[PDB]
Amino acid sequence: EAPAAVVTGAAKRIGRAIAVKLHQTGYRVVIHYHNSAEAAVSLADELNKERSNTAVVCQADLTNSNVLPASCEEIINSCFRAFGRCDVLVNNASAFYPTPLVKTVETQVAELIGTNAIAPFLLTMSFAQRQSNLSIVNLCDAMVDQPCMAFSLYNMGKHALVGLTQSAALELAPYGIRVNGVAPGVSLLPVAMGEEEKDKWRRKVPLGRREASAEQIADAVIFLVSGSAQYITGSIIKVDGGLSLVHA
Amino acid sequence: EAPAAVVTGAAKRIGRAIAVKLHQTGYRVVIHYHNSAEAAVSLADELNKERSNTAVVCQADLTNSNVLPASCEEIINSCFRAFGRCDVLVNNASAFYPTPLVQGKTVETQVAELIGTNAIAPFLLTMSFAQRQSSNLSIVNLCDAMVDQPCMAFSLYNMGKHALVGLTQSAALELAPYGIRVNGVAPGVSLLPVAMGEEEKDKWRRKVPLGRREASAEQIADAVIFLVSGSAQYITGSIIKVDGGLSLVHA
Amino acid sequence: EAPAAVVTGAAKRIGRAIAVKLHQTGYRVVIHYHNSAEAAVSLADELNKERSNTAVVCQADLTNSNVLPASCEEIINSCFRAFGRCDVLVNNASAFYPTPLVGKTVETQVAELIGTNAIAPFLLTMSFAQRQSSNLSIVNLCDAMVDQPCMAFSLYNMGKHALVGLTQSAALELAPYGIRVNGVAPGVSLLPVAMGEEEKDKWRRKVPLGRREASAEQIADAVIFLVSGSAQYITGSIIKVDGGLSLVHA
Amino acid sequence: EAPAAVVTGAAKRIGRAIAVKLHQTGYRVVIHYHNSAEAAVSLADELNKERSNTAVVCQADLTNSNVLPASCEEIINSCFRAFGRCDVLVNNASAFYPTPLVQKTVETQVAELIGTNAIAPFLLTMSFAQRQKSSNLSIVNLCDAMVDQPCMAFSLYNMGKHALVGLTQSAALELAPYGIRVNGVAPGVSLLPVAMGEEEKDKWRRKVPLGRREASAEQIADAVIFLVSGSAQYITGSIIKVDGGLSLVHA
Ligand SMILES: NC(=O)c1ccc[n+]([C@@H]2O[C@H](COP(=O)([O-])OP(=O)(O)OC[C@H]3O[C@@H](n4cnc5c(N)ncnc54)[C@H](OP(=O)(O)O)[C@@H]3O)[C@@H](O)[C@H]2O)c1
Ligand SMILES: NC(=O)c1ccc[n+]([C@@H]2O[C@H](COP(=O)([O-])OP(=O)(O)OC[C@H]3O[C@@H](n4cnc5c(N)ncnc54)[C@H](OP(=O)(O)O)[C@@H]3O)[C@@H](O)[C@H]2O)c1
Ligand SMILES: NC(=O)c1ccc[n+]([C@@H]2O[C@H](COP(=O)([O-])OP(=O)(O)OC[C@H]3O[C@@H](n4cnc5c(N)ncnc54)[C@H](OP(=O)(O)O)[C@@H]3O)[C@@H](O)[C@H]2O)c1
Ligand SMILES: NC(=O)c1ccc[n+]([C@@H]2O[C@H](COP(=O)([O-])OP(=O)(O)OC[C@H]3O[C@@H](n4cnc5c(N)ncnc54)[C@H](OP(=O)(O)O)[C@@H]3O)[C@@H](O)[C@H]2O)c1
Ligand SMILES: COc1ccc(OC)c(CCc2csc3nc(N)nc(N)c23)c1
Ligand SMILES: COc1ccc(OC)c(CCc2csc3nc(N)nc(N)c23)c1
Ligand SMILES: COc1ccc(OC)c(CCc2csc3nc(N)nc(N)c23)c1
Ligand SMILES: COc1ccc(OC)c(CCc2csc3nc(N)nc(N)c23)c1
């Protein structure tokens, strides 16, 4: 019986790379998406071409709301329905945009704190409640202590996610559920970002003056879920090419 | 003219100790409170007896909601209404209770209270404080020295306090150009919960290397007063542990 | 042709497990040792029986002194002499014992504890870099408990904190040369041979994930990840392998 | 009776400002120096003009060596011989220069950089505590806010400063039962090197969010004064950044 993984925000970019690598390793996968239905199904189609009935999609908004807990319960339920088990949860989905101190602000709070922290918390609860090499991997941020200017809410969300990673590692250890993070520095740059701004970031990276591929981020995820990480819990692995070590 | 400070959750315990010490230092104070009206008014009375028209109370729920931004804005407005300025903001108010991951309040409410009080309200209050502004403007966030060795089953509380570290850093960076410093004070064990039995209190006390006792409220307030003072005018983005070595002690 | 790795303090325990796993992955290995000559030679024998001419021993005291730079250069030299290349350095050797603030002299304690845990890693890093399709990296055996240290282990703890600093500074400075520098930070793994069983069990019961210490092989697994092609964007990172021990309050 | 403090490397710059502020606070002081005899004596004479018999100087090399333990014991002993007590130790003296990994002997660089920044502090701490085997005893270590984002090619310096963090934590834990608190102050950019061109000084100044300027020596001293004060008596194992937010600024 193959293990099964849920990957949030898995239609594109880093989440897609993670889904693909888990699938290549032998997992059956739930590809969660919010707006990217076409891309989510295209990925499922590709994975199911390789191995029939090993990939399904699941739609949900992960914005904080009165219905978020039910939405997160259903994401976990979708894995059990499709595959009869849920071994791995990857909290990858994330809103990312500036929120200057000086969309309504309450909506920004709901999206940024919801996707990056509250949904991971609720998914973690539902994952644990429903329960071998069980683990959770949270996509963190190597730059949390040297944050982007005017990204307070995003940064708060990513700090909260560090807190969840630690608290859940502690509390779920008795159940044999490990809880770890992967912290990219600069990986795939935002599609909306200009080419000049992208190159400004790349030239800051000590190791090769380039961003991490999605696959390089996924490699750390694969390690953490693997049998080679069986004693590792509450750890956050930076995958940042030394970017966080570089002073102003 | 005397400077003015807002202290959230200032009716009792650490919040009161901070309000009292700021007042003793020459600040006029807004004593924010949620449910503790009697205690808030009693404190304001004591302070106004010491110096007339130097303390007012301000009631607000800091639970997350769509009106929280308006509530936070009104807290800062109340300081300007009373005193014509707002030099210091102390984010002290905090919900604190367990939220077990594996099994009264709905999870939605728990998220709203624990994340709202510890992180979102601080953020909105920070926004409003900055938007309203020789000078010594600053914000102090009451953090938690144990955030990396958290209490079992307190994930949402811990998440909120981590978020608060993030705000302290992000806001220090962004508000520096406005001369608004943003720092934190991180108690370990200070005043134990009223509902806690003495045996459980003593268990915590005997963990603290420096004197096997909890921090007094005044000791926490002392670090706050330092950070708002002219003796800290180059300090921003710093979180000062006031924990008697507790966070250094392994399992 | 096969890459080559230096592992310090490789004759026994975690260093041996690291040497063995690297060897199983395809590395030729320099098994550095100080006092454990018989165990070092026995391991080299086992590894060479598996693949001929893939293991050598190299003896060196890694206590701080005016000759330590020469000793460290000679360790790296021994890898080039045996194998013609040096792809991986694992800084594992370590003195570990209490040095209370209130038989060995204090100058010897400083020399041993700071030398093995920090200065030798530095000098080995220098010599490794100076001697340099490729995948060059250094892995430093750190300590997950550096911020919640054992009582009366100040010099040891200072050494391990210095090793964190080295890992970071060297990651930064050697990145332009394609040399990655990372760490692995055990919590409780193989307990000291001298420790009494009661105290061993005390430590085991503190670990959230399984109430047991890490095996040497579990520590080695993280080293193998960091030197692998699956870590080629990772530098300046220290991976805790502690079963959650460092998360547990007093 | 007046308390007494030892300040290492106190002839100039930050150490001098610390010595002055301690003296202004009421401390008698041991002004340790290595090469700067004239500056040390000039300070001593200035302080003794203020209050007779309140300042002495103590010469020592704090490079790592076989004799360093004796030298450190003698520094502490000097404070007892001068003043009959030793309440405060400030580990400020520090060698600082690049040590590139790829191309003074290296063993000398090790001895100087690790000796001054880590081993001498450790030995001074041992000696301080052994002599202590109303009171407010404490140690303040001058750390570095940039230890996790170090200058390129300063590995041995950075190693020494990381080691000093370890000492600060380990000694806080171990000495807490004796009532001796151990803390740090971590400047980011404070007084720039004397030779440094203003154009290079400005490159660093412009990076500092809070005021685009370096910390004065006096601002660093202010944080030391807080930590040794009665307002910090629950604070141990804490390192206070005094960096204007520099360490929060990404590349
Ligand atoms: N890229 C980087 O350089 C970098 C750096 C540091 C950390 N990270 C972290 O690594 C992870 C992946 O990064 P990425 O750049 O690949 O992420 P991304 O493209 O910004 O977002 C990934 C997905 O998150 C989903 N998402 C956004 N808002 C959502 C909402 N309200 N509800 C449900 N899903 C929502 C979206 O799914 P749909 O498209 O289906 O709507 C989106 O495709 C994130 O956690 C990110 O913070 C990335
Ligand atoms: N006590 C400790 O040992 C300790 C340890 C570490 C950190 N800290 C931190 O230091 C600060 C002070 O601690 P403390 O023990 O004095 O705090 P506390 O007694 O638990 O709470 C302080 C005040 O928070 C206010 N509050 C709670 N929920 C609120 C809501 N929904 N809306 C508005 N206000 C709300 C309450 O005001 P009303 O009474 O008016 O309802 C309460 O009096 C907190 O931030 C805490 O996290 C304390
Ligand atoms: N074991 C744990 O629970 C644990 C926890 C945290 C971190 N770590 C770290 O992980 C690494 C491996 O731990 P371990 O317990 O396997 O180490 P260990 O047994 O204490 O020491 C490994 C080797 O270090 C060598 N060594 C000691 N002093 C030396 C000197 N003066 N010169 C040269 N070599 C010297 C010894 O080699 P010879 O036998 O040949 O003399 C010894 O076998 C160490 O860096 C340790 O600090 C271990
Ligand atoms: N300045 C900054 O921007 C900055 C930034 C971060 C941290 N810090 C830290 O704050 C502290 C003060 O900084 P600073 O710039 O004022 O220091 P500094 O001028 O570089 O050095 C202070 C003193 O250290 C003494 N010293 C150097 N080598 C010694 C040796 N081998 N033995 C004994 N004493 C020796 C010297 O004494 P003599 O002159 O008598 O020879 C020197 O005057 C240091 O610990 C430093 O690392 C400073
Ligand atoms: C100002 O825009 C910036 C500045 C710095 C950046 O890396 C240091 C990036 C990379 C993209 C990114 C980082 S977290 C993150 N999180 C999500 N959910 N998506 C992303 N695309 C990113 C973008
Ligand atoms: C299980 O109850 C515990 C466990 C550990 C504790 O300190 C190490 C405390 C002290 C009270 C407390 C800490 S954060 C905090 N935050 C608020 N808003 N209120 C409080 N009363 C506390 C209580
Ligand atoms: C009081 O003795 C202790 C206390 C705590 C411990 O783990 C948390 C250990 C495990 C052995 C150990 C840790 S670093 C270390 N370093 C070396 N070179 N060797 C070792 N054997 C160890 C022993
Ligand atoms: C290349 O020169 C540099 C680069 C960056 C710097 O600040 C971040 C400084 C300030 C001086 C300094 C920092 S630690 C330090 N330590 C000692 N013992 N002395 C100093 N003078 C300094 C100088």
XYZ file of N, CA and C in Angstrom, chain C residues 146 173 176 239:
12
model
N 22.924 23.979 22.447
C 23.858 25.078 22.726
C 23.205 26.255 23.461
N 31.936 32.810 3.005
C 33.213 33.111 2.361
C 33.599 32.115 1.279
N 31.560 31.397 -3.079
C 32.154 31.695 -4.407
C 33.012 30.579 -5.007
N 21.130 21.506 10.741
C 19.942 20.672 10.859
C 19.959 20.004 12.227
